[PDB]
Structures are given as structure tokens and as C-alpha cells.
Design a protein around this motif. Structure first.
Motif, PDB file in Angstrom:
ATOM      1  N   UNK A  20       0.717  -1.214  -0.167  1.00 35.91           N
ATOM      2  CA  UNK A  20      -0.041   0.105   0.103  1.00 35.91           C
ATOM      3  C   UNK A  20       0.731   1.293  -0.076  1.00 35.91           C
ATOM      4  N   UNK A  21       2.414   1.293   0.008  1.00 36.45           N
ATOM      5  CA  UNK A  21       3.092   2.318  -0.193  1.00 36.45           C
ATOM      6  C   UNK A  21       3.271   2.922   1.224  1.00 36.45           C
ATOM      7  N   UNK A  22       3.013   2.247   2.426  1.00 35.14           N
ATOM      8  CA  UNK A  22       3.338   2.710   3.465  1.00 35.14           C
ATOM      9  C   UNK A  22       4.675   2.545   4.092  1.00 35.14           C
ATOM     10  N   UNK A  23       5.430   3.674   4.349  1.00 30.39           N
ATOM     11  CA  UNK A  23       6.840   3.279   5.015  1.00 30.39           C
ATOM     12  C   UNK A  23       6.822   2.568   6.362  1.00 30.39           C
ATOM     13  N   UNK A  24       7.691   1.717   6.297  1.00 31.72           N
ATOM     14  CA  UNK A  24       7.970   0.710   7.427  1.00 31.72           C
ATOM     15  C   UNK A  24       9.444   0.861   8.031  1.00 31.72           C
ATOM     16  N   UNK A  25       9.711   0.622   9.346  1.00 30.37           N
ATOM     17  CA  UNK A  25      10.889   0.660   9.667  1.00 30.37           C
ATOM     18  C   UNK A  25      11.382  -0.910   9.271  1.00 30.37           C
ATOM     19  N   UNK A  26      12.904  -1.049   9.169  1.00 27.43           N
ATOM     20  CA  UNK A  26      13.387  -1.916   8.767  1.00 27.43           C
ATOM     21  C   UNK A  26      14.745  -2.505   9.750  1.00 27.43           C
ATOM     22  N   UNK A  27      14.787  -3.847   9.906  1.00 29.13           N
ATOM     23  CA  UNK A  27      16.261  -4.316  10.420  1.00 29.13           C
ATOM     24  C   UNK A  27      17.150  -4.360   9.339  1.00 29.13           C
ATOM     25  N   UNK A  28      18.366  -3.713   9.954  1.00 30.37           N
ATOM     26  CA  UNK A  28      19.638  -3.668   9.187  1.00 30.37           C
ATOM     27  C   UNK A  28      20.459  -4.630  10.014  1.00 30.37           C
ATOM     28  N   UNK A  29      21.322  -5.383   9.368  1.00 35.34           N
ATOM     29  CA  UNK A  29      22.346  -6.395   9.920  1.00 35.34           C
ATOM     30  C   UNK A  29      23.604  -5.969   9.452  1.00 35.34           C
ATOM     31  N   UNK A  30      24.591  -5.842  10.465  1.00 35.63           N
ATOM     32  CA  UNK A  30      25.773  -5.450  10.325  1.00 35.63           C
ATOM     33  C   UNK A  30      26.628  -6.631  10.582  1.00 35.63           C
ATOM     34  N   UNK A  31      27.644  -6.976   9.580  1.00 35.84           N
ATOM     35  CA  UNK A  31      28.344  -8.277   9.948  1.00 35.84           C
ATOM     36  C   UNK A  31      29.861  -8.087   9.873  1.00 35.84           C
ATOM     37  N   UNK A  32      30.638  -8.199  10.688  1.00 39.83           N
ATOM     38  CA  UNK A  32      32.229  -8.253  10.418  1.00 39.83           C
ATOM     39  C   UNK A  32      32.499  -9.608  10.073  1.00 39.83           C
ATOM     40  N   UNK A  33      33.089  -9.597   8.845  1.00 41.92           N
ATOM     41  CA  UNK A  33      33.286 -10.927   8.070  1.00 41.92           C
ATOM     42  C   UNK A  33      34.808 -11.102   7.873  1.00 41.92           C
ATOM     43  N   UNK A  34      35.354 -12.407   8.196  1.00 40.59           N
ATOM     44  CA  UNK A  34      36.774 -12.972   7.733  1.00 40.59           C
ATOM     45  C   UNK A  34      37.040 -12.862   6.160  1.00 40.59           C
ATOM     46  N   UNK A  35      35.904 -13.078   5.639  1.00 42.86           N
ATOM     47  CA  UNK A  35      35.819 -12.960   4.022  1.00 42.86           C
ATOM     48  C   UNK A  35      34.409 -12.627   3.385  1.00 42.86           C
ATOM     49  N   UNK A  36      34.778 -12.309   2.178  1.00 43.50           N
ATOM     50  CA  UNK A  36      33.365 -11.965   1.431  1.00 43.50           C
ATOM     51  C   UNK A  36      32.532 -13.001   0.777  1.00 43.50           C
ATOM     52  N   UNK A  37      33.267 -13.943   0.278  1.00 42.75           N
ATOM     53  CA  UNK A  37      32.642 -14.922  -0.837  1.00 42.75           C
ATOM     54  C   UNK A  37      31.442 -15.488  -0.399  1.00 42.75           C
ATOM     55  N   UNK A  38      31.490 -15.957   0.722  1.00 48.07           N
ATOM     56  CA  UNK A  38      30.336 -16.748   1.017  1.00 48.07           C
ATOM     57  C   UNK A  38      28.783 -15.964   1.345  1.00 48.07           C
ATOM     58  N   UNK A  39      29.321 -14.514   1.825  1.00 51.85           N
ATOM     59  CA  UNK A  39      28.187 -13.533   2.148  1.00 51.85           C
ATOM     60  C   UNK A  39      27.804 -12.918   0.782  1.00 51.85           C
ATOM     61  N   UNK A  40      28.665 -12.925  -0.134  1.00 55.21           N
ATOM     62  CA  UNK A  40      28.002 -12.129  -1.611  1.00 55.21           C
ATOM     63  C   UNK A  40      27.667 -13.210  -2.250  1.00 55.21           C
ATOM     64  N   UNK A  41      27.641 -14.512  -2.038  1.00 52.61           N
ATOM     65  CA  UNK A  41      26.972 -15.754  -3.007  1.00 52.61           C
ATOM     66  C   UNK A  41      25.681 -15.882  -2.398  1.00 52.61           C
ATOM     67  N   UNK A  42      25.385 -15.667  -0.873  1.00 50.67           N
ATOM     68  CA  UNK A  42      24.343 -16.013  -0.551  1.00 50.67           C
ATOM     69  C   UNK A  42      22.971 -15.206  -0.921  1.00 50.67           C
ATOM     70  N   UNK A  43      22.004 -15.649  -1.122  1.00 53.12           N
ATOM     71  CA  UNK A  43      20.785 -14.959  -1.552  1.00 53.12           C
ATOM     72  C   UNK A  43      20.270 -14.543  -0.182  1.00 53.12           C
ATOM     73  N   UNK A  44      19.010 -13.647  -0.295  1.00 55.44           N
ATOM     74  CA  UNK A  44      18.406 -13.104   0.656  1.00 55.44           C
ATOM     75  C   UNK A  44      17.791 -14.126   1.645  1.00 55.44           C
ATOM     76  N   UNK A  45      17.369 -15.043   1.124  1.00 62.99           N
ATOM     77  CA  UNK A  45      16.715 -16.461   1.866  1.00 62.99           C
ATOM     78  C   UNK A  45      17.853 -16.916   2.595  1.00 62.99           C
ATOM     79  N   UNK A  46      18.970 -17.159   2.119  1.00 56.08           N
ATOM     80  CA  UNK A  46      20.039 -17.888   2.639  1.00 56.08           C
ATOM     81  C   UNK A  46      20.994 -17.112   3.726  1.00 56.08           C
ATOM     82  N   UNK A  47      21.004 -15.599   3.424  1.00 58.34           N
ATOM     83  CA  UNK A  47      21.691 -14.906   4.588  1.00 58.34           C
ATOM     84  C   UNK A  47      20.834 -14.733   5.644  1.00 58.34           C
TER      85      UNK A  47
END
Length: 130
Positions: A20-47
Motif C-alpha cells: 500500500x506504499x506505507x513506509x515501515x521500519x526495517x532491520x539492518x544487520x551489520x556483519x564483521x566478516x573474515x571473508x566476503x565470498x560466502x556472504x556475497x554468494x548468499x541470496x536473501x533467504x540464505x543470508x
């Protein structure tokens, strides 16, 4: 060089809108990562709902923040010396998985010791900004 992760996460008035176009708050997750490959390859559901143990192995620390429409969140978090990347991913209702605009990743060389990196949340997107 970088002792502390400094982020300034700022929302436009219209973020994460319902159908309906109504703005809603959102959770933002911040990750400290040893490497980027797994994170970058993950889809939204997987992450966000998945049991990726390679991803789990890469995450040193994680914070969940709650961003209001028109609001802002300051992250000033100890940066682990093994954190080669910082991932930031928003749990949007409607992520654009085709354009991959629901997350950003920063290498260490993209952070500043005493100044935050600004991340804009606008609609269903995240953007790193000066």
C-alpha cells in the motif's frame, strides 16, 4: 589502523514500503566478516533464514539495528582485526534480488578511523554515500 567500525545509517522518509506504499521500519544487520565470498554468494533467504555453516564460520560479530523511516542509526563498534570485510544487509520486505541493492560490503580500505561511512536507505535500497 582502524580500531572502530563507524557507520551512519540514514533513512529517507519513504523506506521499506508495504504494498500500500506505507513506509515501515526495517532491520539492518551489520556483519564483521573474515571473508566476503560466502556472504556475497548468499541470496536473501540464505543470508537471513539459512543454515550456511561456511557463512557462520565467516561471521566474527553481528549487530541488528532497527531503522525508522526518516530516522538514523550510528554504529560505533570495535572492528575485529580479522574482519577483512563489513557487510550491511537490510531485511527489506521487497528486496530487489535481481539488482542486488539490499546489501553493501566494505573492505577495510573503505573504512575511516574517525569518520563514519554513510549508508542511505531509500525505498528498498542501500547506497554508500559521501
Amino acid at each position: 589502523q582502524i580500531k572502530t567500525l563507524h557507520l551512519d545509517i540514514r533513512a529517507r522518509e519513504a523506506i521499506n514500503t508495504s504494498a500500500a506504499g506505507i513506509p515501515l521500519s526495517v532491520v539492518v544487520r551489520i556483519y564483521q566478516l573474515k571473508d566476503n565470498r560466502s556472504f556475497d554468494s548468499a541470496d536473501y533467504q540464505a543470508l537471513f533464514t539459512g543454515d550456511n555453516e561456511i557463512l557462520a564460520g565467516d561471521i566474527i560479530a553481528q549487530k541488528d539495528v532497527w531503522l525508522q523511516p526518516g530516522g538514523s542509526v550510528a554504529v560505533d563498534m570495535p572492528l575485529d582485526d580479522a574482519a577483512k570485510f563489513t557487510g550491511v544487509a537490510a531485511m527489506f520486505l521487497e528486496p530487489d534480488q535481481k539488482k542486488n541493492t539490499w546489501r553493501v560490503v566494505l573492505g577495510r580500505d573503505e573504512l575511516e578511523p574517525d569518520t563514519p561511512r554513510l549508508i542511505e536507505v531509500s525505498g528498498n535500497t542501500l547506497t554508500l554515500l559521501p
